[PDB]
Symmetry: C3
C-alpha cells in the first residue's frame, strides 16, 4: 500500500539517485549537490533495487526492475540507459 | 506479511546500519565492530531504503522512508538526524 | 505479487551480486565480468537486503533475510556463508 524505493550515491558532493516503484512504474529523482530533479529513467516495474560503482571518475549504475518473476537490468554508463544482460536463470 | 529491511556499511571494521520497516515504523540496528545495538533512528514508514558515503572519514547517511506515495528523506551527518530536501515532484 | 531484489557490487570489473526473494526463498545471481551465473546463496526469506565492503582486495558481504519479524544475517568473507550475529533486539 506504499511506494517502494532504492537509493545509490557516489562521490563526495555527492550525487544521489533515488528510484521509486509506484503502481507498476519506476521513476528516478536525482541530486547533484543543489536541488532534486527528475531523471531520465522511466521503466515498468513493481520492485526496484540499484547498485553503482566508479571506474576512476566515471559512474556506472545498474537498476534491477522486477514485474512478477521477471527482473530486467537497466544500465547507465555515462551516456544513456541500456538493457543489461541479467537473467534469473540460464 | 514480513518486515522489510535496508542496509548500508562503511569503513573496514566496518560500521553497518540495518533499517527495518515494521508495522509502519522504521527502526535502526547498528554494528561498530563489537555487538549489535539500537540506533537513534525511529521514524514512520512502511518502506525504507538507504545510501551512505564518506567525505574523508566522515559518514553521511540518507534514509528514504515512504508511507503511501510520500517519501521523506532523513539525513545523518555526524551529529543528529535532520529532514532532507528530497521531494518526489517539483 | 512480484519478486523482490537487492543488489551489491564491488571493484571496477565489477563484481555484482543480485539477491531475489521469491515465494519465501532467496537466491543469488552473480556477475564477475563475463556472464551471469547462479551463486551458492540459497536461504529462506520473504525479504532481502544486502551490503558489502572491501578490506584491501577482500570482499565481505552481509545479506539480511527476513521472514515475519525475524531477520537472519548471512555473511560472506571469501570462503563460505556463515550465520551472522545480527539480532533485532537485545
Ligand atoms: O543528471 C541526471 C542523470 O543524467 O544522471 C545519470 C542518470 O541517473 C540519469 O538517468 C539521469 O538523468
Ligand atoms: O555493459 C553492461 C553490462 O555488461 O555491465 C555488466 C553487467 O551489469 C551486465 O549484465 C551488463 O550487460
Ligand atoms: O552509533 C550509532 C549511531 O550514532 O550511528 C550513526 C547513526 O546510525 C545513528 O542513528 C546511530 O545512533
Ligand atoms: O545536507 C542535507 C542534504 O542537503 O544532503 C544532500 C541531499 O540528501 C539533500 O536532500 C539534503 O537536504
Ligand atoms: O563466484 C560466486 C560466489 O562465490 O561469489 C561470492 C558469493 O557471492 C558466493 O555466494 C558466490 O557463489
Ligand atoms: O564475522 C561476522 C560478523 O562479525 O561480521 C560483522 C557483523 O556482520 C556481525 O553480525 C557478523 O557476525
Amino acid at each position: 500500500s506504499s511506494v517502494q524505493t532504492a537509493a545509490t550515491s557516489w562521490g563526495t558532493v555527492p550525487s544521489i539517485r533515488v528510484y521509486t516503484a509506484n503502481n507498476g512504474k519506476i521513476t528516478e529523482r536525482c541530486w547533484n549537490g543543489k536541488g532534486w530533479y527528475t531523471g531520465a529513467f522511466n521503466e515498468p516495474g513493481d520492485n526496484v533495487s540499484v547498485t553503482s560503482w566508479l571506474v576512476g571518475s566515471a559512474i556506472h549504475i545498474r537498476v534491477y526492475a522486477s514485474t512478477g518473476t521477471t527482473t530486467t537490468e537497466w544500465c547507465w554508463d555515462g551516456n544513456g540507459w541500456t538493457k543489461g544482460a541479467y537473467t534469473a536463470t540460464n
